[PDB]
Amino acid sequence: SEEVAVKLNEWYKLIRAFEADQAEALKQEIEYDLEDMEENQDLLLYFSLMEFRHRIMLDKLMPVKPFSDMLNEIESNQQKLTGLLEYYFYYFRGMYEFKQKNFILAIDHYKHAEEKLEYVEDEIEKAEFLFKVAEVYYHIKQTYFSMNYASQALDIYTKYELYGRRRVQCEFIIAGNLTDVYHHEKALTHLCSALEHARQLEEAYMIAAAYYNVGHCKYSLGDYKEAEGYFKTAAAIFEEHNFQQAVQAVFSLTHIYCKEGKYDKAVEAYDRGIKSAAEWEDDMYLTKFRLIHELYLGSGDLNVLTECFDLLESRQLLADAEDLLHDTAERFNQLEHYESAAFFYRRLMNIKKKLAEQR
Amino acid sequence: PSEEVAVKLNEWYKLIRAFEADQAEALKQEIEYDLEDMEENQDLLLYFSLMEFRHRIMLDKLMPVKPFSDMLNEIESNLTGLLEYYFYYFRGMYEFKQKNFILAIDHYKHAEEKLEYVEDEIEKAEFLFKVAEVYYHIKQTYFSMNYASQALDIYTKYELYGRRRVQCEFIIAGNLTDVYHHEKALTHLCSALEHARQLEEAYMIAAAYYNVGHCKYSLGDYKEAEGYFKTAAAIFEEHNFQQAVQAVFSLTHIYCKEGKYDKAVEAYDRGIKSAAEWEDDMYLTKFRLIHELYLGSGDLNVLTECFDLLESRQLLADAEDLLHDTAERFNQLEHYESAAFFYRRLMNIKKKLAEQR
Amino acid sequence: ERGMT
Amino acid sequence: ERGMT
Ligand SMILES: [Cl-]
Ligand SMILES: [Cl-]
């Protein structure tokens, strides 16, 4: 009854602390305790929700090259959900939609979960929710709300002296937002602090992410030479530990080689990137690689570029589409292909409008 | 008497915030008359000077003319608690009036630190509105939205349906328009228009009409927006408000986009004449811009010069709109080089707007 | 242009 | 591109 219900909450704590081995051991213990008890739909729905959250953690730590199944099972009994479980329902599904790059849907789930945030018992657990909200807001370039949520989260971690993965991630988001408003120096200060904090965590994923973000910031600043090494370092760490983030890292590396006119290195990075993206079945980065290749290493065929942007927009990756459109428009402008430049400037306008109306 | 005149000074402030010009003026003359028959009290004299400054702001809003900096220098040549709050707040109001938005915000933010000395919640609502107002003019939508919502909630809570509440509705709608939520903006504007009519103040009714036209223009309904700009222009011009210049400008601009060049010329002449009478060099620059673009030969040097003046004056939101219009105009004329030139500058302006966050 | 207040 | 978390 309450005892196993306590175990489920103790399981939740291990999950949020990224304690994979301890979470697995406690899950199996709960499973045995559930099969040796009477019919309890309240705890069965509790377990199903927590099992879903558990798989999200495992996939994040150890990604591979049945979420939908678990999702539909939970949704089949959502009329029974109330209070705490209803909060988990919207929160966990919001987390899953973020993974699937369905940002608008993720936010809608988060906002519904936020209405029942009273069922969170401690500020540290609350801080995780605030980060996740700030995280998805950053991916739709909602800078204002993202900064607000990330700052609240960061203050909680600072207050309780909890220097874990979540705090470093809060620093990433704050820096990312600052870069979006071109406050690069402030952003770099945060990223430098986040990098050393990531090293203290001794987690390869976070160290590599920290290196990418510094490169990302310097790239935005225009320091292309410096950004090279950061992208290269991040790509190496991500590949060595078999993370899918290695794809994005190589893409940014390829893109910057193209911008610098380092076509030989761009070609090598391109081949490396499309091969990696193919292994991860990452169709969107394959499209992105196809785009920049056409723009820099190819003929610059407008039909190919249009199709690539059509694909990005159809997947609702508007922030990335905005960046690549700006890059495409400016590229044709620098090459004095004014008709093509004007064409992509207008599509850039359209995307900026869609970005603004979604907020 | 030094304790009783402070009471009168606060009563004077109340009348000023309520736009009661006649009563405020009578109390101003009485206080200033009584101060001449008193010993020299420093903080009390600074109290008066600050309030006289706030009084002149109110008078110019109700009855504009075609000494502010002089009395500003006297104030700045000279504070703690309440008087320090007034110091930053009133100077913030002045800077907004002079279209110095960044400086106005900086002043407001310093004033906000001393907001604890404000006991009147309605008084706080006015402050929150003014903050929302200036944020809107630099397109900081969500800071503006938050402050405007806080202010609107206070006015609603006290059921105080005066000028400030309508202005709050104007700002909220203006912000919604900036994020292309025209349907929600129109809902707020139609409510604001009726609230303006209830105030029976020509200024607010005309402003409501302009804002409806502004929203519909952003929506793309040029035909409807034309009528609203016309009505707003007529009302503002009847009561001799400087807002008639902007109203006629938007009217001139929409005539140009509709292709009604005869009416555009007529509105243009009317507008530059009014802008000259008000010594509004910036609208003279704006009129020259759209005339060259639509009614002239579209000379790039002339256009660039006009945009250079707008940007240097830090009117980034206005420059953004006009740059977008200029780029779009050259694009549909298939002047792609000129179009790309203004699209690039539009990019640069959007970046500047964003950097100021 | 900006809306009026 | 978006920064990583
Ligand atoms: Cl943590
Ligand atoms: Cl009022």
Author numbering:
A (entry chain B): 7 to 71, 78 to 371
B (entry chain A): 6 to 71, 78 to 89, 93 to 371
C (entry chain D), D (entry chain C): 1 to 5
According to the publication:
The large family of Gram-positive quorum-sensing receptors known as the RNPP proteins consists of receptors homologous to the Rap, NprR, PlcR, and PrgX proteins that are regulated by imported oligopeptide autoinducers. Rap proteins are phosphatases and transcriptional anti-activators, and NprR, PlcR, and PrgX proteins are DNA binding transcription factors. Rap proteins and their inhibitory oligopeptides, called Phr peptides, have been most extensively studied in B. subtilis, which encodes 11 Rap proteins on its chromosome and another five on plasmids. Sequence and structural analysis shows that the Rap proteins are repeat proteins consisting of nine HTH TPR or TPR-like folds, which pack together to form a right-handed superhelical TPR domain.
Following the discovery that RapJ and PhrC form a regulatory pair, we crystallized and determined the 2.16 Å resolution X-ray crystal structure of the RapJ-PhrC complex. Readily interpretable electron density corresponding to each residue in the PhrC pentapeptide was observed, and PhrC was modeled only after the RapJ model was nearly complete. Relative to its position in the RapH-Spo0F and RapF-ComAC structures, the entire N-terminal 3-helix bundle and linker region have dramatically flipped and repacked against the N-terminal surface of the C-terminal TPR domain in the RapJ-PhrC structure. In fact, the RapJ 3-helix bundle (residues 1–70) and helix-containing linker region (residues 71–94) merge with the C-terminal TPR domain (residues 95–373) to form one extended TPR domain (residues 1–373). PhrC binding stabilizes a closed RapJ conformation that differs from the open RapI conformation due to a compression of RapJ along the TPR superhelical axis. RapJ-PhrC interface mutations E147A, Y150F, D192A, N225A, F250A, and K300E resulted in a complete loss of sensitivity to PhrC and, together with previous mutagenesis studies, confirm the biological importance of the crystallographically identified RapJ-PhrC interface. New intramolecular RapJ contacts that form as a result of the PhrC-induced compression stabilize the RapJ closed conformation and are necessary for PhrC inhibition of RapJ Spo0F phosphatase activity.
